[PDB]
Design a protein around this motif. Sequence first.
Motif, PDB file in Angstrom:
ATOM      1  N   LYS A  69      65.831  25.240 -37.256  1.00 49.91           N
ATOM      2  CA  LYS A  69      66.762  24.558 -36.364  1.00 49.91           C
ATOM      3  C   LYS A  69      66.798  23.093 -36.745  1.00 49.91           C
ATOM      4  O   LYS A  69      65.763  22.421 -36.694  1.00 49.91           O
ATOM      5  N   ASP A 128      71.208  37.620 -30.913  1.00 51.89           N
ATOM      6  CA  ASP A 128      70.889  37.391 -29.501  1.00 51.89           C
ATOM      7  C   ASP A 128      71.346  38.617 -28.707  1.00 51.89           C
ATOM      8  O   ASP A 128      72.077  39.471 -29.218  1.00 51.89           O
ATOM      9  N   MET A 169      65.104  35.159 -35.860  1.00 51.20           N
ATOM     10  CA  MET A 169      65.691  36.160 -34.961  1.00 51.20           C
ATOM     11  C   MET A 169      67.152  36.305 -35.361  1.00 51.20           C
ATOM     12  O   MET A 169      67.928  35.348 -35.266  1.00 51.20           O
ATOM     13  N   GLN A 207      75.304  39.172 -28.176  1.00 50.89           N
ATOM     14  CA  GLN A 207      75.908  39.853 -29.321  1.00 50.89           C
ATOM     15  C   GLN A 207      75.758  41.356 -29.212  1.00 50.89           C
ATOM     16  O   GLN A 207      76.725  42.089 -29.369  1.00 50.89           O
TER      17      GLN A 207
END
Length: 348
Positions: A37, A96, A93, A99
């Motif tokens: 991130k 989510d 990951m 989705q």
Amino acid sequence: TFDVGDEYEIIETIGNGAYGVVSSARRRLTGQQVAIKKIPNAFDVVTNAKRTLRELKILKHFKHDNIIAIKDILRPTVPYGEFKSVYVVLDLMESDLHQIIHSSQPLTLEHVRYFLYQLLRGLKYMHSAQVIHRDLKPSNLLVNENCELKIGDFGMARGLCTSPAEHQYFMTEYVATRWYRAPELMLSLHEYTQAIDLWSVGCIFGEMLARRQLFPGKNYVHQLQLIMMVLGTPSPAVIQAVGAERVRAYIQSLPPRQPVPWETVYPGADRQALSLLGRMLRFEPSARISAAAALRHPFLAKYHDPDDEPDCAPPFDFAFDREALTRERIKEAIVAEIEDFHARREGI
Ligand SMILES: Cc1ncc(-c2nc(Nc3ccc(C(=O)NCCN4CCCCC4)cc3)ncc2F)n1C(C)C
């Protein structure tokens, strides 16, 4: 950088949002997959910088398979004054829960049971640390290729006491996301506990059962209308605890309405599922089942093991967050978290 002579290789961007940019990546030396991130211009906005600091502290405190983990935080590569973008390395990951629910993928009752189990297992641990997430929704529940669910985005988290200095102490109806927002926040009921999260869980649970949002209100009043269409009119005690006179007067203006059974809301849905759902979606925070008690419910018996559903000790301290801090003091605090991350790794 992420070139041949650096620790990481970027594969592709998987998320772009208010949080920054999340990319899949590999550790070059080993081939191990991670998420990275980037939090661009991380210190420019005070509110955002405070979210970054509280997420870093919370995720460093927690070690649990159903909560997203920090694997690395990159040190500054430029002088202190030029350091503007923070890179956090986390578990990769791929998707989510939003989705997954809102796609052509399978979502059988057994998928619902397993995802709900994992969510509640993470919550038992988080709640025992006296941390309330406050923005649980399917897009913040990450799911990987091993079907492991992890709770993410701790920027909106708080403890059992929030400071009067910040606006969300009073403006509770703006906390987090409308469709998942607990009645106590909507109505300013002056009772803000971990039960906040169990409301959101109930909404997520219903959403998995029907593959559509339970209470998709278009505005403040409509949100309350949709909730009351199922739960019925709130009690005199709840109505008297409503902070704002106009809201209280509006609820009183509507005709009396009894609850609609969950069997009518979700025709043909699993009995034990609806039993547990009904224990989560109550107006009164204290009436709601806890995450710990939910794990003991017959719906989750398939996965439940009380030897493998830990609490978190010691509890998390939010003292740092109640301090009135400038931009530069928040930047210093974030840089200290990065330094501490690496200093602790050197001493183990
Ligand atoms: C806030 C945060 N901090 C770190 C992470 C984090 N995220 C991932 N993986 C992700 C991230 C984003 C998406 C995605 O955007 N998918 C497209 C559909 N999405 C439907 C719902 C509305 C938004 C669009 C997919 C996988 N892996 C590890 C992590 F640590 N996060 C997540 C929760 C965004």
